[PDB]
C-alpha cells in the first residue's frame, strides 16, 4: 500500500507539521486507519460524487477534511486543509 502525495497535499501535511501537533496526530491516526482499510473506519469515510468521483473524504476536525483516492495498490492524498 504505497502512499502518494500531490504537491498541494504535501504542502498541507507540512503546514500541520509546523502548526498544531494535535491535528498532526489526528491526521496520522487517519492515515494509519486508511492503511488498514481505505473504505471503512474512523473519521466517517464518504465517497464524493459527480466531478469528484473517485475521491474520498474523512473528517480531521469540524472544519478540515482529508481528501484521498485509491488507484490500485496505493493511496493518494489530495488535501489536508480546507482553507488557508
Amino acid at each position: 500500500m504505497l502512499l502518494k502525495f500531490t504537491e498541494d497535499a504535501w504542502a498541507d501535511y507540512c503546514y500541520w507539521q509546523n502548526q498544531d501537533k494535535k491535528t498532526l496526530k489526528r491526521i496520522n491516526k487517519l492515515i494509519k486507519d486508511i492503511q488498514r482499510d481505505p473504505f471503512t473506519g474512523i473519521g466517517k469515510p464518504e465517497p464524493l460524487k459527480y466531478d469528484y468521483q473517485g475521491a474520498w473524504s474523512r473528517r480531521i476536525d469540524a472544519e478540515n477534511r482529508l481528501i484521498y483516492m485509491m488507484d490500485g495498490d496505493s493511496v493518494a492524498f489530495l488535501s489536508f486543509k480546507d482553507h488557508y
Binding site: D8, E46, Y52, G54, A55, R65, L78, S79
Partner: protein
Amino acid sequence: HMEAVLYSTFRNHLKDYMKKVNDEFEPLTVVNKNPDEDIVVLSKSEWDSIQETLRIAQNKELSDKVLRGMAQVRA
C-alpha cells in the same frame, strides 16, 4: 428523471420503500396533488455523499485543489 410514487403507495409500503432507496442508491420523489407538496426521499448514505461533495463544491479554492490534484494522480 426521478422515480415518482404516490403518497398512498408510499405509506402502504413504507418500510419497504426505505429499503429500496438504500439498495437502489437512487433518489425517489413521492408526488401529491399539490406540485409543491411533493417531497424527495433519499438514503442517508447518498445524502452524506451529496453533502460532503457539496461542501467541497461550495469552496472553489479547495475544489480547484482537489480537481487539480485528481488530474495529477491520474496523469
